[PDB]
Subunit: 122 residues, 3 copies
């Protein structure tokens, strides 16, 4: 085999900023979500969970876009990046041609995500 | 044919660890291996103690996430021995893999990242 | 055979500390930023952007240094530049360097992964 790292991305998001944005323009904020992510979001009852979810998605989607690079990836629509967790709780994103590695974390005030994209060299 | 087995990241609020340690010091110290406990027991400043604990929480959590095993295999925090190379670069050994670790902290936050790489052999 | 990871590094910086650095000791900037980075820093007209830039670069150099390990590089010899899409980049003989930077109002962070060169 001939694996190689294509690119990496990291993003840190201040949860309070996302709280403010969501209170002001909830529908505009929700446009970053895919249909699957929207379905999940619509089942939440509590605002704290809603904001954590959104903040985490902002962070992951940005980290992924940065890792991909290319004009194509820099300009990927956030609502076309479907983030999910596997049956073991590992965050994932499917993207043809790459093995996408993701990791997430959050605290009360911050959400952070990192992405590493690997590729076969040929 | 991946070269990377998994990655993990964790961010920890130091103040939360301060609170936890003040309330349940013994429970908190149980996250440490015997080797880590030996290091901890030599510290004389509280600030260093809390930073050490916060950094270990972050690193152990990042490592756990990089494993990608969910609730499928039980790994105790006191079975993840974070140590230093002779210059202080953080390390963790995990048979079958090459483990890469990096740690950073500020006054209020500790973070850690772990990458588990596939071994050639 | 697969490429190999030489090392990884991460760094988190509180922007207020960097604000204090610049205000109290602007000439320290010369020991941190490369000539190319200094050219960019000197052209900012908005102080908030200027401090964010410096914080991000400081974080990047610390992350790079951690990734390289010591088995030695001056901060003002580690040039992080950006490509035509904005992506931060560092060129360093013997390695493929991967870099990512992120900022919030109060924090800057950077991560670096050094991969071993072959082809
Ligand atoms: Cl933010
Ligand atoms: Cl709206
Ligand atoms: Cl909920
Ligand atoms: Cl979720
Ligand atoms: Cl926390
Ligand atoms: Cl106790
Ligand atoms: Cl001490
Ligand atoms: Cl800091
Ligand atoms: Cl400006
Ligand atoms: Cl340039
Ligand atoms: Cl970036
Ligand atoms: Cl950013
Ligand atoms: Ni594996």
């Amino acid at each position: 085999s001939n694996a190689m790292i294509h690119g990496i991305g990291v993003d840190l998001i201040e949860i309070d900023r996302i709280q403010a944005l969501y209170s002001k323009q909830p529908k505009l904020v929700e446009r970053i979500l895919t249909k699957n992510e929207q379905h999940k979001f619509n089942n939440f009852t509590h605002e704290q969970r809603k904001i954590e979810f959104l903040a985490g998605r902002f962070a992951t989607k940005e980290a992924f876009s940065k890792a991909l690079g290319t004009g194509l990836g820099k300009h990927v629509a956030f609502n076309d990046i479907d983030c999910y967790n596997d049956e073991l709780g590992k965050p994932k994103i499917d993207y043809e041609g790459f093995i996408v590695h993701v990791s997430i974390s959050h605290t009360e005030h911050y959400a952070m995500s990192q992405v590493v994209l690997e590729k076969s060299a040929f």
